[PDB]
């Protein structure tokens, strides 16, 4: 086509989606990770995670308002990844890398798994 | 913070949101523009448009599944802007610029209004 493109559009959309999340506006699911709960938008979760894409395209699970993650999933690891989904920013630290990598593997977030593997290999 | 950032994340999220829209997955509103109907995600509309941000933060209108636009709004103009919302790509042409600009003004999409004004000024 003969379209023009607004460079910052995708980033501005994501910033507003994060603002809606922070204000609990039109959030439609709560992700339960052991004792912790995280409110989010199903569409953002699906757009970022192979696991959530699978769950919310399921004819029964698409209608659930609560999703309980595997008890082995670390809440801080999930929190870091949820923030990444809504911002493109990953808070990767020596103290959380193993939990972040395991959570990204479970959530099927290939690019996160990739940088975790690379950061781990550099420290060995 | 000490975060790392994935450059293509925002663009990849938007691409997946557009894929969900094309497959009518978790769309939660229909925008009626005279004889035409457009299915979308309220969160994406709010993230792109001052008008939709106002409508879906309203305590009564947030719960509506149908939104009827002003009868003066051109369906093709709306279609072009809806595509822009989900892609960052604006199909701006001599034959549609007036309708696109009027629709962007109504929807409160300042950056679109700006490029329309600039393209019009260049042709006078």
């Amino acid at each position: 086509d003969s379209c023009i493109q607004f460079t910052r559009h995708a980033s501005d959309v994501l910033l507003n989606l994060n603002r809606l999340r922070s204000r609990d506006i039109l959030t439609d699911v709560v992700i339960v990770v052991s004792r912790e709960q995280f409110r989010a938008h199903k569409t953002v979760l699906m757009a970022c995670s192979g696991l959530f894409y699978s769950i919310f395209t399921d004819q029964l699970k698409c209608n659930l308002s609560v999703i309980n993650l595997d008890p082995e999933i670390n809440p801080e690891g999930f929190c870091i990844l949820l923030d990444f989904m809504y911002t493109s920013r990953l808070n990767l630290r020596e103290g959380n890398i193993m939990a972040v990598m395991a959570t990204a593997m479970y959530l099927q977030m290939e690019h996160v798994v990739d940088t975790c593997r690379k950061f781990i290999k550099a420290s060995e | 913070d000490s975060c790392i950032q994935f450059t293509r994340h925002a663009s990849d999220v938007l691409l997946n949101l557009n894929r969900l829209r094309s497959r009518d997955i978790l769309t939660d509103v229909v925008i009626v523009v005279s004889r035409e109907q457009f299915r979308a995600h309220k969160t994406v509309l709010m993230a792109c448009s001052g008008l939709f941000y106002s409508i879906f933060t309203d305590q009564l209108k947030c719960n509506l599944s149908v939104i009827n636009l002003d009868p003066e709004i051109n369906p093709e103009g709306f279609c072009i802007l809806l595509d822009f919302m989900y892609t960052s790509r604006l199909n701006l042409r001599e034959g549609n610029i007036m309708a696109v600009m009027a629709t962007a003004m109504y929807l409160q999409m300042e950056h679109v209004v700006d490029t329309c004004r600039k393209f019009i000024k260049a042709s006078e």
């Binding site: 379209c3 023009i4 493109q5 607004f6 460079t7 | 790509r89 604006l90 950056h111 490029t115």
Partner: peptide, 4 residues
């Protein structure tokens, strides 16, 4: 705005 750019030519993509």
């Amino acid at each position: 705005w750019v030519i993509p």
